[PDB]
Amino acid sequence: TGEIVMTSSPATLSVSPGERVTLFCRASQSVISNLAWYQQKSGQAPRLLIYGASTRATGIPSRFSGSGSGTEFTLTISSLQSEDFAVYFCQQYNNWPLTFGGGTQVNVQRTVAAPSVFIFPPSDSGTASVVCLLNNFYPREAKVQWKVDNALQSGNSQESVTEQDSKDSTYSLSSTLTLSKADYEKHKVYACEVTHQGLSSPVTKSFNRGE
Amino acid sequence: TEEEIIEKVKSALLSTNKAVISVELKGRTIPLYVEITKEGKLHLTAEGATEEEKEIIKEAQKAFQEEIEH
Amino acid sequence: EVQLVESGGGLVQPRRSLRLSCAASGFTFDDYTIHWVRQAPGKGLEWVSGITWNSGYIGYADSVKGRFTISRDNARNSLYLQMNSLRAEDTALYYCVRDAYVSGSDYYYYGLDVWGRGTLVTVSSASTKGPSVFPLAPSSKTSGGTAALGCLVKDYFPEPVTVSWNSGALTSGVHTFPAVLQSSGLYSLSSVVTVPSSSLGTQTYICNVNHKPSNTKVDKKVEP
Predict the structure, then answer these.
(1) Residue C137 is nearest to which of A36, A121, A161, comparing CB atoms?
(2) What is the DSSP string of chain A?
(3) 8 Å CB contact between C36 and C50
(4) Please, which residues have CB within 8 angstroms of residue C133's CB and are 6 or more apart in sequence?
(5) Which of B58, C39, C64, C199 has the highest CB neighbour number within 10 Å of its CB?
(6) Rounded CA gap, A70 and A35, in Å?
(7) C185: exposed, middle or buried (C-beta count within 10 Å: 0-12, 13-18, 19+)?
(8) Which of C112, C113, C195 to mutate to test the interface with A (most CBs of A within 10 A)?
(9) Does domain A116-208 sit in CATH 1.10.287.600?
(10) Within chain A, what is the greatest distance between any pair of CA atoms?
């Protein structure tokens, strides 16, 4: 094949301003020092940081430094600042096809915050959907399971997660369960089961069909 | 085979003047160091490579060098 | 002002074709190799294709070979990308990217140093449909005196949809979630807000859904 796969790690990282940040990139074959690093803020084009394995681009602050040669590379932010919260990509240019890593998202570190859980019953008009809301929690990882009549659902739900809030650095998640009006009326109890490390025990919010 | 090496060398010197490619000459995966000068001189280096394996690389290096100048 | 400006993206049906363009400015176009790099929504970067200064070498990713054709016109300082047999997986933001490595130069640079803002390419069989705005009831049953209410915006196409609360009055506590693509090819989001439970009996809360591609302006009253 000849294609060189870039492997980024960690997938996500949480740090506070002032901390030292280290991001890793691994190559499937040797790339020598033909590795670049990019920074991408939300809704913006990638910005080249370091083009040689260690050569900082012109205009890039000195807190950014890169290292490695072969198949193991690192990007170091000596003292992270607020404007450094972004996604960081590695890219080899040893031979075409040019390939990027998955990317490492650096996030704002915060104290754990348990979510407040709410469940919203349907309101139609051929059918409607059930919504479960996890509001202002941290970290992002959270398990949401639907159970109608004590039966675990599967494949009929979709989740959506907000970006880290600019005020409190928390996340919000909404899980929508969609059924037909026929299947919705075949069951009585619709429960949203929520697991999160900020909760001392799994939280179950449920309702009976018909308010 | 010798044409398939020129292909991989050509794809390596597109975004960089120095690269390393893996070539399967005959029953062995040979690491190959590819280098180009500003004037356009290509050197192919094989390390721990048998004389035979070295000569096939010299033949590929000559064939691509003529294509570069022409 | 070294910059690359893309054009030509829009809505396209599967199996059809689309031609992207890129205009260069502020640098010698005939000295650099130029690349197309795409980014799926919320995913990584993927190299699509590249051309050398003289079109002497042309490369394609295996996912687009045979279907995509790249070409350049150094007389017009323009780059082009002809996309054929388009698939839904081709939906992405397409960047026009200049390579920094100029062979034969005295001082070498590397990487991808000049990017465009990108042009969005959506491949979908869906037709423009206005949003169906449903209510999320602030059920009176705790959360430490905090109540949650919202409205569900289901079955709409294409993006985007702007949601406001009480005509820009209510802002704090609002979370408009990113739209998810349903299996029906239609988009669906929801907007929620946390309010004092005592305000449920007095305060009126209004959703302000506005879908301009469909010319739909819907206001919905949320009531327990």
Answers:
(1) A121
(2) -----EEEE-SEEEE-TT--EEEEEEESS--TT-EEEEEE-TTS--EEEESSSS-BPTT--TTEEEEE-SSEEEEEESS--GGG-SEEEEEE-SSSSPEE---EEEEE----BPPEEEEE--------EEEEEEEEEBSS--EEEEEETTEE--SSEEEEEPPPPTTT--EEEEEEEE--HHHHTT-SEEEEEEE-TTSSS-EEEEEES--
(3) yes
(4) C151, C152, C153, C207, C209, C218, C220
(5) C64
(6) 9
(7) middle
(8) C112
(9) no
(10) 66
Interchain CB distance below 8 Å, A45 and C116: yes
**Measured between CA atoms, how close is C16 to chain A, in angstroms?**
26
- C-beta separation of C110 from B16 below 8 A: yes
Name, in order, each residue with C-beta under 8 angstroms of C112's C-beta and a sequence gap of 6 or more: A36, A38, A46, A48, A91, A98, C35, C37, C97, C98, C99, C100
Residue B47's nearest CA partner among B66, B64, B28, B62 is: B28
Side chain identity at C65, as an amino acid letter? K
Could you please report the per-residue DSSP string of C67-97? Answer: TEEEEEETTTTEEEEEE-S--GGG-EEEEEE
β-strand C78-83 against A64-68: which pairing, if any? unpaired
- Amino acid in position B41: K
Q: For an interface test with C, which of B9, B17, B64, B69 has the most C Cβ atoms less than 10 Å from its Cβ? A: B17
Cα gap C42→A98, rounded to integer Å: 20
> Which homologous superfamily is A6-108 in?
Immunoglobulins (2.60.40.10)
CA distance B38 to chain C (A): 4
A10, A16, A21, A25: CA torsion to nearest 10: 20
CB contact under 8 A, A48 and C137: no
> Residue C101's closest CA among C92, C90, C110?
C110
Class at the top of the CATH hierarchy for domain C3-123: mainly beta
Name the residue range of residue B64's domain.
Answer: 2-69
Give yes or no for B16 touching C (CB within 8 A). yes
Token pair in block for residue C41: 């929504």
Fold of C132-222: Immunoglobulin-like (2.60.40)
Domain map of chain C by residue range?
3-123, 132-222
Question: What is the tally of structural domains in chain B?
Answer: 1
C contacts of A100 (beta carbons < 8 Å): 44-47
Q: Where are the beta strands (DSSP E) in chain B?
A: 18-24, 29-36, 42-46
Measure CA of the first residue to CA of the last residue in chain B; give whole Å: 22
| Nearest CA-CA distance, residue A101 and chain B, Å | 18
Q: Where in chain A is the domain with CATH 2.60.40.10?
A: 6-108, 116-208
Contact B13 C33 (CB under 8 A): no
Tokens 């026009």 locate to C96
Find the farthest-apart pair of alpha carbons in chain B and give their distance in angstroms, rounded.
35
How was this one solved?
Answer: X-ray
